[PDB]
UniProtKB/Swiss-Prot annotation, chains B, D, F, G:
Keyword Aminoacyl-tRNA synthetase: no
Effect recorded for K52E: 90% loss of cell-wall binding and enzymatic activity of PlyC holoenzyme
Interaction with the host cell wall (site feature) positions: H21, R22, E29, K52, R59
One Pfam family, short name: C1_PlyCB
Any single biological process term in GO: killing of cells of another organism
Protein name in UniProt: Endolysin PlyC, small cell-wall binding subunit
Record text on subunit structure and interactions: Homooctamer. Part of the PlyC holoenzyme, which is composed of 1 PLYCA and 8 PLYCB assembled into a ring structure.
GO molecular function: identical protein binding
Additional detail: Part of plyC operon, which contains plyCA, lil and plyCB genes. Seems to be involved in the internalization by mammalian cells infected by Streptococcus pyogenes.
Variant or mutagenesis effect after changing K52H: Complete loss of enzymatic activity of PlyC holoenzyme
Transmembrane segments: none
Length: 65, 63, 65, 63, 65, 63, 63, 65
Protein backbone atom coordinates (compact mmCIF):
# COMPACT_ATOMS: atom_id res chain seq x y z
CA UNK A 1 0.00 0.00 0.00
CA UNK A 2 2.30 2.73 1.33
CA UNK A 3 6.03 3.13 0.81
CA UNK A 4 8.65 1.61 3.12
CA UNK A 5 10.79 4.40 4.58
CA UNK A 6 12.68 2.10 6.98
CA UNK A 7 14.89 0.23 4.54
CA UNK A 8 13.86 -2.98 6.32
CA UNK A 9 11.96 -5.87 4.74
CA UNK A 10 10.98 -8.94 6.73
CA UNK A 11 8.98 -10.15 9.69
CA UNK A 12 9.17 -11.28 13.29
CA UNK A 13 8.13 -14.84 14.00
CA UNK A 14 7.44 -17.01 17.05
CA UNK A 15 5.30 -20.00 17.98
CA UNK A 16 2.59 -20.25 20.60
CA UNK A 17 3.00 -24.04 20.58
CA UNK A 18 4.39 -26.18 23.37
CA UNK A 19 8.09 -25.85 22.36
CA UNK A 20 8.78 -22.13 22.02
CA UNK A 21 11.92 -20.93 20.24
CA UNK A 22 11.55 -17.37 21.51
CA UNK A 23 11.22 -14.50 19.06
CA UNK A 24 13.20 -14.47 15.81
CA UNK A 25 13.12 -12.36 12.67
CA UNK A 26 14.01 -12.27 9.02
CA UNK A 27 15.54 -8.85 8.34
CA UNK A 28 16.53 -8.19 4.72
CA UNK A 29 16.90 -11.91 4.11
CA UNK A 30 18.98 -12.52 7.25
CA UNK A 31 17.56 -14.67 10.04
CA UNK A 32 18.39 -13.56 13.58
CA UNK A 33 17.34 -14.36 17.10
CA UNK A 34 15.89 -11.61 19.28
CA UNK A 35 16.97 -11.60 22.91
CA UNK A 36 14.93 -8.80 24.51
CA UNK A 37 11.24 -7.91 24.38
CA UNK A 38 12.18 -4.25 23.90
CA UNK A 39 13.60 -5.15 20.49
CA UNK A 40 10.50 -7.16 19.55
CA UNK A 41 8.23 -4.21 20.33
CA UNK A 42 10.56 -1.85 18.46
CA UNK A 43 10.52 -3.87 15.25
CA UNK A 44 6.77 -4.41 15.58
CA UNK A 45 6.56 -0.70 14.71
CA UNK A 46 7.99 -1.30 11.22
CA UNK A 47 7.60 -4.97 10.15
CA UNK A 48 4.85 -7.59 10.54
CA UNK A 49 4.84 -10.14 13.35
CA UNK A 50 3.51 -13.58 12.45
CA UNK A 51 3.22 -17.06 13.96
CA UNK A 52 5.28 -19.95 12.56
CA UNK A 53 5.22 -23.44 14.04
CA UNK A 54 8.59 -24.86 15.04
CA UNK A 55 8.07 -27.72 12.56
CA UNK A 56 7.69 -25.24 9.67
CA UNK A 57 10.72 -22.99 10.28
CA UNK A 58 13.01 -25.20 8.17
CA UNK A 59 10.75 -24.84 5.13
CA UNK A 60 10.40 -21.07 5.62
CA UNK A 61 14.19 -20.72 5.81
CA UNK A 62 14.61 -22.27 2.37
CA UNK A 63 11.99 -19.96 0.86
CA UNK A 64 13.64 -16.91 2.46
CA UNK A 65 16.80 -17.73 0.47
CA UNK B 1 5.92 -1.17 -0.75
CA UNK B 2 5.77 -4.73 0.59
CA UNK B 3 7.41 -4.47 4.00
CA UNK B 4 7.25 -8.21 4.72
CA UNK B 5 9.79 -9.25 2.09
CA UNK B 6 7.42 -12.07 1.11
CA UNK B 7 5.73 -12.46 -2.28
CA UNK B 8 3.50 -15.42 -3.04
CA UNK B 9 0.40 -17.27 -1.92
CA UNK B 10 -0.82 -20.24 0.07
CA UNK B 11 -2.77 -22.89 -1.81
CA UNK B 12 -4.82 -25.96 -0.93
CA UNK B 13 -7.76 -27.94 -2.26
CA UNK B 14 -11.08 -28.62 -0.57
CA UNK B 15 -11.56 -31.68 -2.79
CA UNK B 16 -11.70 -35.26 -1.59
CA UNK B 17 -7.93 -35.88 -1.95
CA UNK B 18 -6.21 -33.17 0.08
CA UNK B 19 -2.56 -32.33 -0.47
CA UNK B 20 -2.48 -30.21 2.69
CA UNK B 21 -1.46 -26.57 2.64
CA UNK B 22 1.42 -25.46 0.43
CA UNK B 23 2.79 -22.09 -0.59
CA UNK B 24 4.87 -20.30 -3.16
CA UNK B 25 7.09 -17.93 -1.20
CA UNK B 26 9.46 -15.78 -3.28
CA UNK B 27 9.25 -18.31 -6.11
CA UNK B 28 9.99 -21.32 -3.86
CA UNK B 29 7.29 -23.95 -3.36
CA UNK B 30 7.07 -25.43 0.15
CA UNK B 31 4.72 -27.56 2.19
CA UNK B 32 3.19 -26.17 5.37
CA UNK B 33 2.73 -28.66 8.20
CA UNK B 34 0.83 -26.77 10.91
CA UNK B 35 -2.29 -24.61 10.96
CA UNK B 36 -0.51 -22.03 13.12
CA UNK B 37 1.87 -21.35 10.22
CA UNK B 38 -1.00 -21.17 7.72
CA UNK B 39 -2.80 -18.56 9.81
CA UNK B 40 0.45 -16.67 10.37
CA UNK B 41 1.16 -16.35 6.66
CA UNK B 42 -2.50 -15.54 5.95
CA UNK B 43 -1.74 -12.23 7.67
CA UNK B 44 0.69 -11.25 4.89
CA UNK B 45 -0.03 -13.24 1.68
CA UNK B 46 -3.23 -14.37 -0.07
CA UNK B 47 -4.63 -17.87 0.37
CA UNK B 48 -6.36 -19.46 -2.63
CA UNK B 49 -7.86 -22.78 -3.70
CA UNK B 50 -6.16 -24.94 -6.35
CA UNK B 51 -7.43 -28.38 -7.32
CA UNK B 52 -4.95 -31.25 -7.13
CA UNK B 53 -5.32 -31.76 -10.89
CA UNK B 54 -4.22 -28.17 -11.60
CA UNK B 55 -1.15 -27.98 -9.35
CA UNK B 56 1.17 -29.33 -12.06
CA UNK B 57 0.20 -26.52 -14.44
CA UNK B 58 0.54 -23.84 -11.75
CA UNK B 59 4.00 -25.20 -10.90
CA UNK B 60 5.11 -24.74 -14.50
CA UNK B 61 3.77 -21.17 -14.60
CA UNK B 62 5.59 -20.30 -11.38
CA UNK B 63 9.39 -20.07 -11.12
CA UNK C 1 -3.54 1.04 -7.74
CA UNK C 2 -2.45 -1.21 -4.87
CA UNK C 3 0.61 -3.44 -4.67
CA UNK C 4 0.62 -7.08 -5.81
CA UNK C 5 1.53 -9.31 -2.86
CA UNK C 6 0.85 -12.57 -4.72
CA UNK C 7 3.83 -12.65 -7.06
CA UNK C 8 1.38 -13.52 -9.86
CA UNK C 9 0.71 -11.40 -12.95
CA UNK C 10 -1.81 -12.43 -15.57
CA UNK C 11 -5.46 -13.20 -16.16
CA UNK C 12 -7.99 -15.97 -16.61
CA UNK C 13 -9.75 -16.12 -19.96
CA UNK C 14 -12.67 -18.00 -21.50
CA UNK C 15 -15.26 -17.46 -24.22
CA UNK C 16 -19.04 -17.39 -23.91
CA UNK C 17 -19.30 -18.09 -27.65
CA UNK C 18 -20.56 -21.26 -29.28
CA UNK C 19 -17.21 -23.14 -29.23
CA UNK C 20 -15.93 -22.97 -25.65
CA UNK C 21 -12.32 -23.83 -24.88
CA UNK C 22 -12.93 -24.06 -21.15
CA UNK C 23 -11.03 -21.79 -18.77
CA UNK C 24 -7.38 -20.94 -19.39
CA UNK C 25 -4.94 -18.46 -17.89
CA UNK C 26 -1.76 -16.54 -18.49
CA UNK C 27 0.29 -16.77 -15.30
CA UNK C 28 3.60 -14.89 -15.35
CA UNK C 29 3.73 -15.13 -19.12
CA UNK C 30 2.92 -18.87 -19.19
CA UNK C 31 -0.33 -20.04 -20.76
CA UNK C 32 -2.04 -22.97 -19.03
CA UNK C 33 -5.35 -24.76 -19.15
CA UNK C 34 -7.46 -24.94 -16.01
CA UNK C 35 -9.22 -28.23 -15.36
CA UNK C 36 -11.36 -27.58 -12.26
CA UNK C 37 -13.74 -24.78 -11.31
CA UNK C 38 -12.20 -24.70 -7.83
CA UNK C 39 -8.96 -23.44 -9.38
CA UNK C 40 -10.79 -20.81 -11.44
CA UNK C 41 -12.49 -19.41 -8.34
CA UNK C 42 -9.20 -19.49 -6.43
CA UNK C 43 -7.30 -17.46 -9.01
CA UNK C 44 -10.25 -15.09 -9.38
CA UNK C 45 -9.24 -13.92 -5.89
CA UNK C 46 -5.90 -12.58 -7.16
CA UNK C 47 -5.98 -11.96 -10.96
CA UNK C 48 -8.57 -10.58 -13.39
CA UNK C 49 -10.91 -12.81 -15.37
CA UNK C 50 -11.73 -11.62 -18.89
CA UNK C 51 -13.50 -12.86 -22.01
CA UNK C 52 -11.51 -13.67 -25.16
CA UNK C 53 -13.10 -15.04 -28.33
CA UNK C 54 -11.63 -18.29 -29.62
CA UNK C 55 -10.69 -16.52 -32.87
CA UNK C 56 -8.59 -13.96 -30.96
CA UNK C 57 -6.55 -16.28 -28.72
CA UNK C 58 -3.80 -16.69 -31.33
CA UNK C 59 -3.23 -12.93 -31.48
CA UNK C 60 -3.26 -12.60 -27.68
CA UNK C 61 -0.66 -15.39 -27.39
CA UNK C 62 1.79 -13.46 -29.56
CA UNK C 63 1.34 -10.29 -27.50
CA UNK C 64 1.84 -12.24 -24.26
CA UNK C 65 5.33 -13.19 -25.51
CA UNK D 1 0.97 -2.77 -9.18
CA UNK D 2 -0.59 -3.99 -12.43
CA UNK D 3 -1.77 -7.50 -11.59
CA UNK D 4 -2.93 -8.30 -15.13
CA UNK D 5 0.52 -8.39 -16.70
CA UNK D 6 -0.88 -6.34 -19.59
CA UNK D 7 0.23 -2.82 -20.55
CA UNK D 8 -1.26 -1.05 -23.54
CA UNK D 9 -4.49 0.16 -25.07
CA UNK D 10 -7.17 -0.68 -27.59
CA UNK D 11 -7.63 1.70 -30.49
CA UNK D 12 -10.14 2.21 -33.30
CA UNK D 13 -11.59 5.00 -35.41
CA UNK D 14 -15.20 6.11 -35.68
CA UNK D 15 -14.45 7.65 -39.08
CA UNK D 16 -15.91 6.51 -42.38
CA UNK D 17 -13.10 4.02 -43.15
CA UNK D 18 -12.90 1.69 -40.16
CA UNK D 19 -9.82 -0.43 -39.53
CA UNK D 20 -11.64 -2.45 -36.86
CA UNK D 21 -10.35 -2.73 -33.33
CA UNK D 22 -6.63 -3.11 -32.71
CA UNK D 23 -4.45 -2.99 -29.63
CA UNK D 24 -0.94 -2.48 -28.39
CA UNK D 25 -0.38 -5.16 -25.76
CA UNK D 26 3.05 -5.15 -24.10
CA UNK D 27 4.49 -3.32 -27.10
CA UNK D 28 3.01 -5.74 -29.66
CA UNK D 29 0.36 -4.47 -32.08
CA UNK D 30 -2.45 -6.92 -32.88
CA UNK D 31 -5.83 -6.91 -34.54
CA UNK D 32 -8.92 -7.88 -32.55
CA UNK D 33 -11.57 -9.80 -34.46
CA UNK D 34 -14.51 -10.13 -32.06
CA UNK D 35 -16.42 -7.70 -29.85
CA UNK D 36 -16.28 -10.18 -26.96
CA UNK D 37 -12.50 -9.78 -26.89
CA UNK D 38 -12.75 -5.98 -27.10
CA UNK D 39 -15.09 -5.87 -24.10
CA UNK D 40 -12.90 -8.35 -22.23
CA UNK D 41 -9.78 -6.24 -22.61
CA UNK D 42 -11.74 -3.06 -21.85
CA UNK D 43 -11.91 -4.42 -18.30
CA UNK D 44 -8.12 -4.11 -17.91
CA UNK D 45 -6.70 -1.58 -20.44
CA UNK D 46 -7.91 1.78 -21.79
CA UNK D 47 -9.71 2.08 -25.11
CA UNK D 48 -9.09 5.21 -27.18
CA UNK D 49 -9.89 6.65 -30.61
CA UNK D 50 -7.17 7.05 -33.26
CA UNK D 51 -7.90 8.23 -36.79
CA UNK D 52 -6.72 6.02 -39.64
CA UNK D 53 -4.44 8.85 -40.82
CA UNK D 54 -2.64 8.96 -37.45
CA UNK D 55 -2.02 5.23 -36.92
CA UNK D 56 1.29 5.33 -38.81
CA UNK D 57 2.68 7.98 -36.46
CA UNK D 58 1.45 6.17 -33.34
CA UNK D 59 3.09 2.97 -34.61
CA UNK D 60 6.45 4.74 -34.85
CA UNK D 61 6.11 6.15 -31.33
CA UNK D 62 5.28 2.72 -29.92
CA UNK D 63 7.81 -0.13 -29.75
CA UNK E 1 -0.51 9.06 -8.05
CA UNK E 2 -2.06 6.03 -9.76
CA UNK E 3 -0.38 3.48 -12.00
CA UNK E 4 -0.12 3.86 -15.79
CA UNK E 5 -1.86 0.90 -17.45
CA UNK E 6 -1.54 2.32 -20.98
CA UNK E 7 2.18 1.82 -21.57
CA UNK E 8 2.27 5.41 -22.88
CA UNK E 9 4.26 8.27 -21.34
CA UNK E 10 4.15 11.77 -22.78
CA UNK E 11 1.88 14.69 -23.55
CA UNK E 12 0.00 16.48 -26.29
CA UNK E 13 1.06 20.04 -27.01
CA UNK E 14 -0.20 22.98 -29.06
CA UNK E 15 -0.06 26.77 -28.97
CA UNK E 16 -2.92 29.24 -28.74
CA UNK E 17 -0.62 31.95 -30.11
CA UNK E 18 -0.85 33.63 -33.49
CA UNK E 19 1.20 31.00 -35.41
CA UNK E 20 -0.36 27.63 -34.63
CA UNK E 21 1.52 24.43 -35.43
CA UNK E 22 -1.53 22.24 -34.94
CA UNK E 23 -1.51 19.49 -32.33
CA UNK E 24 1.61 17.43 -31.70
CA UNK E 25 2.66 14.93 -29.05
CA UNK E 26 5.60 13.31 -27.35
CA UNK E 27 4.80 9.60 -27.04
CA UNK E 28 7.44 7.50 -25.29
CA UNK E 29 10.12 10.01 -26.23
CA UNK E 30 9.04 10.21 -29.89
CA UNK E 31 7.66 13.48 -31.25
CA UNK E 32 4.82 13.17 -33.76
CA UNK E 33 2.31 15.39 -35.46
CA UNK E 34 -1.39 14.69 -35.01
CA UNK E 35 -3.56 15.12 -38.07
CA UNK E 36 -7.12 14.55 -36.81
CA UNK E 37 -9.04 15.90 -33.82
CA UNK E 38 -10.37 12.38 -33.14
CA UNK E 39 -6.82 11.31 -32.27
CA UNK E 40 -6.28 14.33 -30.02
CA UNK E 41 -9.43 13.54 -28.03
CA UNK E 42 -8.45 9.87 -27.84
CA UNK E 43 -5.02 10.54 -26.37
CA UNK E 44 -6.49 13.16 -24.03
CA UNK E 45 -8.03 10.14 -22.27
CA UNK E 46 -4.59 8.81 -21.27
CA UNK E 47 -1.92 11.57 -21.36
CA UNK E 48 -1.85 15.26 -20.38
CA UNK E 49 -2.45 18.05 -22.88
CA UNK E 50 -0.42 21.21 -22.34
CA UNK E 51 0.33 24.50 -24.08
CA UNK E 52 3.80 25.19 -25.51
CA UNK E 53 4.67 28.36 -27.40
CA UNK E 54 6.12 27.86 -30.87
CA UNK E 55 9.30 29.65 -29.75
CA UNK E 56 9.83 27.12 -26.94
CA UNK E 57 9.37 23.85 -28.86
CA UNK E 58 13.06 23.67 -29.81
CA UNK E 59 14.12 23.78 -26.16
CA UNK E 60 11.51 21.20 -25.13
CA UNK E 61 12.73 18.85 -27.89
CA UNK E 62 16.25 18.83 -26.46
CA UNK E 63 14.97 18.07 -22.95
CA UNK E 64 12.78 15.25 -24.28
CA UNK E 65 15.97 13.53 -25.53
CA UNK F 1 3.10 6.43 -12.18
CA UNK F 2 4.08 9.66 -13.94
CA UNK F 3 2.15 9.53 -17.20
CA UNK F 4 3.67 12.72 -18.61
CA UNK F 5 7.18 11.35 -19.08
CA UNK F 6 8.50 14.59 -17.56
CA UNK F 7 10.47 14.86 -14.31
CA UNK F 8 11.77 18.20 -13.07
CA UNK F 9 10.73 21.69 -12.08
CA UNK F 10 10.47 25.25 -13.31
CA UNK F 11 12.51 27.86 -11.48
CA UNK F 12 12.77 31.66 -11.45
CA UNK F 13 13.63 34.46 -9.05
CA UNK F 14 11.44 37.33 -7.92
CA UNK F 15 14.56 39.34 -7.05
CA UNK F 16 15.65 42.54 -8.74
CA UNK F 17 17.80 40.81 -11.40
CA UNK F 18 15.51 38.32 -13.14
CA UNK F 19 16.93 35.46 -15.19
CA UNK F 20 13.50 34.68 -16.64
CA UNK F 21 11.91 31.27 -16.29
CA UNK F 22 14.05 28.16 -16.65
CA UNK F 23 13.45 24.48 -16.02
CA UNK F 24 15.15 21.18 -15.38
CA UNK F 25 13.31 18.66 -17.55
CA UNK F 26 14.57 15.07 -17.32
CA UNK F 27 17.94 16.34 -16.11
CA UNK F 28 18.32 18.90 -18.92
CA UNK F 29 18.32 22.60 -18.05
CA UNK F 30 16.54 24.88 -20.53
CA UNK F 31 15.31 28.43 -20.74
CA UNK F 32 11.61 29.13 -21.25
CA UNK F 33 10.79 32.13 -23.41
CA UNK F 34 7.00 32.51 -23.22
CA UNK F 35 4.48 32.60 -20.39
CA UNK F 36 2.20 30.21 -22.29
CA UNK F 37 4.88 27.52 -21.98
CA UNK F 38 5.41 28.27 -18.28
CA UNK F 39 1.70 27.86 -17.56
CA UNK F 40 1.57 24.73 -19.70
CA UNK F 41 4.34 23.02 -17.78
CA UNK F 42 2.91 24.24 -14.47
CA UNK F 43 0.13 21.73 -15.15
CA UNK F 44 2.57 18.81 -14.86
CA UNK F 45 5.70 19.84 -12.88
CA UNK F 46 6.29 22.01 -9.80
CA UNK F 47 7.36 25.64 -10.08
CA UNK F 48 9.71 26.98 -7.39
CA UNK F 49 11.74 30.10 -6.59
CA UNK F 50 15.55 30.05 -6.76
CA UNK F 51 17.66 33.16 -6.22
CA UNK F 52 20.14 34.06 -8.95
CA UNK F 53 22.99 33.58 -6.45
CA UNK F 54 21.93 29.97 -5.76
CA UNK F 55 21.45 28.74 -9.35
CA UNK F 56 25.11 27.72 -9.69
CA UNK F 57 24.85 25.40 -6.68
CA UNK F 58 21.55 23.90 -7.85
CA UNK F 59 23.11 23.26 -11.27
CA UNK F 60 25.91 21.24 -9.67
CA UNK F 61 23.43 19.19 -7.62
CA UNK F 62 21.36 18.42 -10.71
CA UNK F 63 22.60 16.18 -13.55
CA UNK G 1 8.05 8.03 -3.75
CA UNK G 2 10.44 8.93 -0.92
CA UNK G 3 11.32 12.55 -1.60
CA UNK G 4 13.85 12.81 1.24
CA UNK G 5 16.44 10.49 -0.28
CA UNK G 6 16.80 8.86 3.14
CA UNK G 7 15.97 5.23 3.96
CA UNK G 8 16.52 3.82 7.43
CA UNK G 9 15.62 4.26 11.07
CA UNK G 10 16.82 5.70 14.35
CA UNK G 11 17.38 3.27 17.20
CA UNK G 12 18.10 3.49 20.93
CA UNK G 13 17.46 1.52 24.10
CA UNK G 14 15.56 2.61 27.19
CA UNK G 15 17.45 0.02 29.24
CA UNK G 16 19.86 0.78 32.05
CA UNK G 17 22.96 0.91 29.80
CA UNK G 18 22.20 3.46 27.09
CA UNK G 19 24.19 3.56 23.87
CA UNK G 20 22.66 6.92 22.92
CA UNK G 21 20.80 7.42 19.68
CA UNK G 22 22.09 5.80 16.50
CA UNK G 23 20.69 5.38 13.01
CA UNK G 24 20.95 3.36 9.85
CA UNK G 25 20.78 5.89 7.02
CA UNK G 26 20.98 4.43 3.50
CA UNK G 27 22.71 1.34 4.88
CA UNK G 28 25.30 3.32 6.87
CA UNK G 29 25.25 3.12 10.67
CA UNK G 30 26.06 6.37 12.50
CA UNK G 31 25.86 7.79 15.99
CA UNK G 32 23.72 10.84 16.67
CA UNK G 33 25.08 13.27 19.24
CA UNK G 34 22.34 15.87 19.75
CA UNK G 35 18.61 15.69 20.42
CA UNK G 36 17.97 18.37 17.78
CA UNK G 37 19.24 15.95 15.13
CA UNK G 38 17.16 13.08 16.53
CA UNK G 39 13.98 15.17 16.36
CA UNK G 40 14.92 16.40 12.89
CA UNK G 41 15.28 12.91 11.49
CA UNK G 42 12.16 11.76 13.34
CA UNK G 43 10.29 13.92 10.82
CA UNK G 44 11.38 11.67 7.94
CA UNK G 45 12.36 8.18 9.23
CA UNK G 46 10.96 5.86 11.92
CA UNK G 47 12.45 5.69 15.41
CA UNK G 48 12.43 2.31 17.16
CA UNK G 49 13.77 0.67 20.32
CA UNK G 50 16.56 -1.93 20.14
CA UNK G 51 18.14 -3.45 23.24
CA UNK G 52 21.91 -3.22 23.56
CA UNK G 53 22.11 -7.03 23.47
CA UNK G 54 20.35 -7.16 20.08
CA UNK G 55 22.32 -4.46 18.23
CA UNK G 56 24.98 -6.94 17.07
CA UNK G 57 22.36 -9.10 15.34
CA UNK G 58 20.63 -6.11 13.74
CA UNK G 59 24.01 -4.91 12.44
CA UNK G 60 24.56 -8.24 10.68
CA UNK G 61 21.10 -8.13 9.11
CA UNK G 62 21.67 -4.60 7.83
CA UNK G 63 24.18 -3.76 5.08
CA UNK H 1 3.04 8.02 -0.31
CA UNK H 2 2.68 9.97 -3.56
CA UNK H 3 5.04 10.05 -6.53
CA UNK H 4 7.91 12.54 -6.86
CA UNK H 5 7.40 14.61 -10.02
CA UNK H 6 10.29 16.99 -9.29
CA UNK H 7 13.24 14.71 -9.98
CA UNK H 8 14.75 15.95 -6.69
CA UNK H 9 15.50 13.79 -3.65
CA UNK H 10 16.94 15.26 -0.48
CA UNK H 11 16.31 17.74 2.30
CA UNK H 12 17.16 21.18 3.61
CA UNK H 13 18.93 21.32 6.95
CA UNK H 14 19.91 23.97 9.49
CA UNK H 15 20.51 24.23 13.23
CA UNK H 16 18.70 26.38 15.78
CA UNK H 17 21.68 26.00 18.12
CA UNK H 18 24.11 28.70 19.15
CA UNK H 19 26.50 28.29 16.17
CA UNK H 20 24.36 28.48 13.04
CA UNK H 21 25.76 27.34 9.70
CA UNK H 22 22.94 28.93 7.72
CA UNK H 23 20.74 26.79 5.50
CA UNK H 24 22.19 23.90 3.51
CA UNK H 25 20.72 21.03 1.51
CA UNK H 26 21.37 17.58 0.16
CA UNK H 27 20.04 17.53 -3.41
CA UNK H 28 20.37 14.20 -5.22
CA UNK H 29 23.28 13.23 -3.00
CA UNK H 30 25.09 16.56 -3.44
CA UNK H 31 25.55 18.85 -0.45
CA UNK H 32 25.25 22.58 -1.14
CA UNK H 33 25.00 25.79 0.79
CA UNK H 34 21.97 28.02 0.28
CA UNK H 35 22.63 31.75 0.19
CA UNK H 36 19.16 33.33 -0.04
CA UNK H 37 15.94 32.76 1.88
CA UNK H 38 14.01 32.84 -1.41
CA UNK H 39 15.74 29.59 -2.40
CA UNK H 40 15.01 27.99 0.98
CA UNK H 41 11.29 28.74 0.65
CA UNK H 42 11.31 27.51 -2.95
CA UNK H 43 12.80 24.13 -2.11
CA UNK H 44 10.53 23.84 0.93
CA UNK H 45 7.78 23.37 -1.67
CA UNK H 46 9.30 20.09 -2.89
CA UNK H 47 11.66 18.56 -0.25
CA UNK H 48 11.57 18.24 3.54
CA UNK H 49 13.30 20.71 5.84
CA UNK H 50 14.83 19.25 9.00
CA UNK H 51 17.05 20.30 11.89
CA UNK H 52 20.58 18.91 12.21
CA UNK H 53 22.98 19.96 14.96
CA UNK H 54 26.34 21.29 13.79
CA UNK H 55 28.07 18.45 15.68
CA UNK H 56 26.11 15.84 13.69
CA UNK H 57 26.63 17.14 10.14
CA UNK H 58 29.87 15.16 9.69
CA UNK H 59 28.10 11.88 10.45
CA UNK H 60 25.17 12.73 8.16
CA UNK H 61 27.58 13.52 5.32
CA UNK H 62 29.07 10.03 5.47
CA UNK H 63 25.62 8.41 5.41
CA UNK H 64 24.58 10.57 2.44
CA UNK H 65 27.44 8.99 0.45
Amino acid sequence: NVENVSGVQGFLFHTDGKESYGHRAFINGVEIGIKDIETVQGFQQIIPSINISKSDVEAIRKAMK
